[PDB]
Amino acid sequence: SESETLNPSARIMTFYPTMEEFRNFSRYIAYIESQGAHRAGLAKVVPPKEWKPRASYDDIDDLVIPAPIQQLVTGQSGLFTQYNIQKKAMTVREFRKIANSDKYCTPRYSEFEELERKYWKNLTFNPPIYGADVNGTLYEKHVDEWNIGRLRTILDLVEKESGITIEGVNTPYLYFGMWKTSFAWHTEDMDLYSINYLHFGEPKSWYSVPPEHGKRLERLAKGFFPGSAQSCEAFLRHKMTLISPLMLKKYGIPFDKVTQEAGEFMITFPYGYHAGFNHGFNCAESTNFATRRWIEYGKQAVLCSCRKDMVKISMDVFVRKFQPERYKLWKAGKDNTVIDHTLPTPEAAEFLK
Numbered sequence: 001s002e003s004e005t006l007n008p009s010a011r012i013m014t015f016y017p018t019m020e021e022f023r024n025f026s027r028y029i030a031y032i033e034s035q036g037a038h039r040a041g042l043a044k045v046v047p048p049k050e051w052k053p054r055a056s057y058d059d060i061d062d063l064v065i066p067a068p069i070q071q072l073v074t075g076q077s078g079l080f081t082q083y084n085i086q087k088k089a090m091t092v093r094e095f096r097k098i099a100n101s102d103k104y105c106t107p108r109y110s111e112f113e114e115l116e117r118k119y120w121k122n123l124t125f126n127p128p129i130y131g132a133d134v135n136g137t138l139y140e141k142h143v144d145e146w147n148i149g150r151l152r153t154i155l156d157l158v159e160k161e162s163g164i165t166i167e168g169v170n171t172p173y174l175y176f177g178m179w180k181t182s183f184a185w186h187t188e189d190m191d192l193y194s195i196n197y198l199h200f201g202e203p204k205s206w207y208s209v210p211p212e213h214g215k216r217l218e219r220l221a222k223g224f225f226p227g228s229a230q231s232c233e234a235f236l237r238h239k240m241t242l243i244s245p246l247m248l249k250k251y252g253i254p255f256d257k258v259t260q261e262a263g264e265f266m267i268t269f270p271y272g273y274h275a276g277f278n279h280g281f282n283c284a285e286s287t288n289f290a291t292r293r294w295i296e297y298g299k300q301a302v303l304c305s306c307r308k309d310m311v312k313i314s315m316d317v318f319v320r321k322f323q324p325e326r327y328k329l330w331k332a333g334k335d336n337t338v339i340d341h342t343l344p345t346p347e348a349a350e351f352l353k
């Protein structure tokens with residue numbers, strides 16, 4: 001089909017919008033999907049150079065980080081499990097000082113491949129500290145383009161209808177990273193989209209697996225961590241599992257890599273597995289969002305069954321509003337719709353024309 005013909009390689013795509021294109025978020029997501037970006041599970045958007053979401057970042061040093069986490073990694077042979085050790089609350093100037101410490105600072109290198117090799121070589125040593133999951137935003141209250149605090153997608157239906165707020169999902173998170181800080185392989189909660197903006201600092205590097213191959217990754221993971229898989233159907237949602245690209249290559253898992261610079265956006269797509277690490281001191285802001293296309297993913301997302309605090313969104317409202325003709329069938333457990341990961345979201349239809 002025409003969707004199979006676009007981005008047939010499922011490679012990560014980079015987009016350079018004009019300020020006019022950049023204005024409407026959902027519309028531009030539908031555009032990049034109409035170009036097949038979603039097939040990679042991950043895409044980069046460089047905003048127009050004339051766009052800035054904050055005046056200056058010089059006031060941050062006093063901002064608080066309630067629960068920094070020390071990332072202890074255990075494993076070998078490209079397979080690792082990451083345990084978080086919550087450290088005491090600390091300011092940003094403290095975190096920055098510790099991050100630029102001779103102990104934790106970035107190593108010297110030339111090509112990115114050298115720093116990547118060093119990452120996968122020393123990942124288990126000198127556990128760094130990640131200032132992750134900090135409630136807040138660095139956007140100025142007047143920025144209307146791609147504002148992570150108010151993107152105005154249909155995910156807003158969760159709060160609007162129920163008042164439920166889910167920190168980091170329909171609210172923004174800040175991530176203060178230092179060298180060697182990692183995010184494990186995962187798809188977003190409820191297999192939503194995510195948006196990640198790198199405010200400032202050293203780059204953040206990403207690996208992505210096309211959604212149409214996600215299941216393969218899962219199978220591989222189950223073979224490597226059979227205990228975890230036995231305990232929980234979706235153990236990858238614990239966000240503790242690190243797998244090196246050489247392991248993926250070795251077992252035929254298709255993936256792609258991209259490096260994220262300050263001032264750039266990354267979009268992750270439904271059921272797009274991703275992982276990565278930070279090069280040094282930096283600050284990112286992210287949240288989740290949805291499109292009509294996500295609804296089916298939401299209905300079929302395989303959720304963690306071993307933790308009672310995992311994120312779970314009621315899909316009822318979305319099915320009633322956008323899939324009325326199926327609601328009954330779905331409530332009776334008979335909606336056997338099959339997801340085609342290559343299709344773009346219906347909102348993109350006008351771009352397809």
Ligand SMILES: O=C(O)CNC(=O)C(=O)O
Binds near residue numbers: 175182194268274
């Ligand atoms: O910033 C991080 O450490 C991890 N970010 C994501 O997984 C994301 O934006 O989808």
Ligand SMILES: [Cl-]
Binds near residue numbers: 228229
């Ligand atoms: Cl195991």
Ligand code: NI
Binds near residue numbers: 186187188194268274
């Ligand atoms: Ni993510």
Ligand SMILES: [Zn+2]
Binds near residue numbers: 231233235304306307
């Ligand atoms: Zn679980």
